[PDB]
Ligand binder design. Sequence first.
Ligand SMILES: Nc1ncnc2c1ncn2[C@@H]1O[C@H](COP(=O)(O)OP(=O)(O)OP(=O)(O)O)[C@@H](O)[C@H]1O
Ligand SMILES: *[C@@H]1O[C@H](CO)[C@@H](O[C@@H]2O[C@H](CO)[C@@H](O)[C@H](O)[C@H]2NC(C)=O)[C@H](O)[C@H]1NC(C)=O
Ligand SMILES: [Ca+2]
Ligand SMILES: [Ca+2]
Ligand SMILES: [Ca+2]
Lengths: 38, 260, 373
Amino acid sequence: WEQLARDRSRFARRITQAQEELSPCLTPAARARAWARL
Amino acid sequence: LKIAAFNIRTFGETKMSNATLASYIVRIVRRYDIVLIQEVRDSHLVAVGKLLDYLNQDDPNTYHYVVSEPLGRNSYKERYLFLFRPNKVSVLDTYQYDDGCESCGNDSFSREPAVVKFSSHSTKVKEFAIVALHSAPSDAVAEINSLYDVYLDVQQKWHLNDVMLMGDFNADCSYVTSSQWSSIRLRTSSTFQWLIPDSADTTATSTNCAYDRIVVAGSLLQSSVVPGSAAPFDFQAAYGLSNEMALAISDHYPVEVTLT
Amino acid sequence: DETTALVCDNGSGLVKAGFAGDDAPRAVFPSIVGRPRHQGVMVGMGQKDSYVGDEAQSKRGILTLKYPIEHGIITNWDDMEKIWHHTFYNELRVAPEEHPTLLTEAPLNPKANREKMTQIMFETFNVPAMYVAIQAVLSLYASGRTTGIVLDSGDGVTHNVPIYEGYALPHAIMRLDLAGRDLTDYLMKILTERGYSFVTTAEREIVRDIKEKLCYVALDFENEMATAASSSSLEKSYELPDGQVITIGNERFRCPETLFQPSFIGMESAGIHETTYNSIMKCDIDIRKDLYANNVMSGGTTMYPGIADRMQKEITALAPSTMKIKIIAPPERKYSVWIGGSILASLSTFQQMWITKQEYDEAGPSIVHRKCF
Ligand SMILES: Nc1ncnc2c1ncn2[C@@H]1O[C@H](COP(=O)(O)OP(=O)(O)OP(=O)(O)O)[C@@H](O)[C@H]1O
Ligand SMILES: *[C@@H]1O[C@H](CO)[C@@H](O[C@@H]2O[C@H](CO)[C@@H](O)[C@H](O)[C@H]2NC(C)=O)[C@H](O)[C@H]1NC(C)=O
Ligand SMILES: [Ca+2]
Ligand SMILES: [Ca+2]
Ligand SMILES: [Ca+2]
């Protein structure tokens, strides 16, 4: 179960990489900025 | 009530898309209140669908169906298709015979019999089962013999002695010789009447083989059979066809019987 | 099992379904509902009113087939309810009332379509929460950026979707109604012109397989058409399941060329390279540098070998001379929409973005516009 161990942590790393990159776009302030844009 | 078992050689999209071959097949089916079609080579049930469209153009409930998944130990696979008139009979229950473990190499049938319990208010027998078998030619003796166990199985599940077993058994000529009949319990047991005899010709070719059979067990079903009604239907003779066009339909005749 | 959020990517051709947190969808099956044309049973079964996905495809002969997602948009809600019922109960083996459910929508999905989607999830399926994400936006997220322009090409529709700071720019979204099944049909036509016949159902479904396996995008089309006869490597052989062996030559790259030259199938529309350029030129001049440098390709119809290198060429030709251009073609891009949905729904930040049953019960279907954008 070694290819799986590598794949699980690879995806876990993508999610933590998305917490950094994406979450600042999903803050109530940013969504209000985005909501005003349209 | 008229019942038939008809092996239609390579019954698929090509044969049903042919307006001539479709005409003759539909005319044959229309003779019967119940008909078993064997050798259905129909990956996506398109031929079966096109046949039902044809049969149900005017009244959408002329024919209802009981059809199987593609059956076979190898890539070569056939379905069993029951077509019946729902105004003449009803289907109370159906099941595929459990012929044992395929992966073990112990399964008794290449194409496991489809089994249908019928309600027939118009005949002496009110409830009876039909067991379908298109046997593997080179395993005919073992498979016809195994239908004895299928009968016992029908008895266990439905408490029903009134069972019709029919289809291309390959039950003559090279595949079942005179001496091998004593190994087949379905023939050696007095429980079973063989309505299609050894002398019958069920081949559209120039061969003389009683390949296709109808076999009946139970007092009521046996007493419902119209004496002498069990025979092959020579569609070449009846439709004044050439031998070439006859073979283009099928290399087997239907075997039919009338109940009352 | 009983808590984890669901991700359902609803495509014209294929439904992609699984659990938020997984790196791949559990279930991928055709977006098809089939109903029996006649009364009958399969041996050992009761009467079925509908089949969905693989079984509907494999039994299509005795059924009337429905494709309720046309060019990315759901157009039949009775059929779509049975696709969703199949997704939850048959494919994922979950109770929808136990699981928050993220659905995906086409870019510029009409508001009525959006609302009916939200209504069904809450009223028909009793989901505790739900969200609706633009498919192109999830793809960009899965590529690990919040700014860029996505080319999403599937079975039914192709879209250019420019995205800035995590949100689509709707006024710059382009829609080309040329995609997978148009390419399959064109290949079937030109292979027929070569002198082959696809008549029986068994022989008509394989043309898609040939397309997915042997087709590619020529870097220079004009050049490869002249080299066609000359080349020793172009012609390839494909074995049918029955035994027949057919030969495919210039048809390999002529098929997907349709993406760049829609005229091939009688469309007066502009090619995917032109729509990509036109999409960027509809955006603010201030961000185009970042768009040009982040072309992310998505969906099964971007899988053709060479399409990445061909986009590079055709856009460099159209763009300003010194513009830094980069085409990203993720190996996972036939499931990038779903995977992006799995990541979004796994974020702690996203847990207050869900439309809850409470919120839907107070606001009604029109809530979807407030919460999902
Ligand atoms: N390797 C491949 N090469 C070319 N085409 C491919 C390949 N793999 C899949 N496809 C095609 O991609 C299409 C499926 O893509 P996708 O799953 O993204 O579409 P969809 O979401 O069902 O449709 P849409 O996004 O248009 O609503 C089909 O037409 C399929 O034949
Ligand atoms: C419908 O079926 C018949 C029989 O299979 C086809 O008939 C034959 O055609 C071939 C070549 O055209 C001839 O060599 C045979 O002699 C014909 N056989 C018979 C028995 O007539 C017929 O072509 C089919 N029709 C269509 C339109 O496909
Ligand atoms: Ca078997
Ligand atoms: Ca004969
Ligand atoms: Ca899609």
